[PDB]
Amino acid sequence: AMTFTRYSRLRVIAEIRNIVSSIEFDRDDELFATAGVSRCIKVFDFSSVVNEQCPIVEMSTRSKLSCLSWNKHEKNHIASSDYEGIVTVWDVTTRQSLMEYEEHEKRAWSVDFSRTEPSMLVSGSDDCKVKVWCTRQEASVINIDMKANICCVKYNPGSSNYIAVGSADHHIHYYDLRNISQPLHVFSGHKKAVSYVKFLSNNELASASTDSTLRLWDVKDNLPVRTFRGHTNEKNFVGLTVNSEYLACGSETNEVYVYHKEITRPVTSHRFGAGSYFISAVCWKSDSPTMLTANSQGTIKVLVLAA
């Protein structure tokens, strides 16, 4: 619950030396994948990266990628969302696109595979729609017409009935997919678009916004909890990743920031290393102090919180 006193720094344990828009671990934290403007989904072996730097899979795409989400049951399956609006499910062993969902009419910023109903995935787009898909069906299962651009959609980790939707309207819309006529709750507090939403647990939701804050919310009792400050994020998608205790995000200062969920100012930060670069993607290795990070130059680092 309170391990932050153990840590003062992030150590670099590996570096792979354009923009990486997304970096994500597979179901077992064995492989990770990167994707971005270069139209190539690259899969790396985490253990090889730490011990040694060539990807073990490279899948070319039709469009720049905005987001990746690995399937939580089918080890080899990974979804992507791209700038043409296409949501694709890939098999990293065969390299084939298994599904190409094409209903979005503008760039899709986000895709997320459900942890608990692993054939379900959700996407959000500049077309102001949230779409829920099932890997066994070609047509969307659920469509939510919203009023503003959707930057991020994330399933609750304990139930596929709930999604958090981060909107350009500055709010987080929390839906029960069993009745989409109204969200369960809409969380106001951010002053700019909500670029990411991520759950620490079934009841704890975090968000990032281009108001240079992260925020923590209680989705059991629909309460604001805490606002986190220190990083610079006024313009770009700079990444958000959370686990049971920690939030990490990028910064337009080319720094990674780590917050403990109980403390509003950073536990630590790391300068990536003249130029205006930004951190563009982050991903914890589950509840451990290890994290993947990447920036707008395409550099990837494996970092670990340390004393």
Partner: peptide, 11 residues
């Protein structure tokens, strides 16, 4: 610019 977050200010 490609990773700029959208801004919305309509109805």
């Amino acid at each position: 610019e490609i990773r700029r977050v959208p801004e919305f200010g309509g109805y």
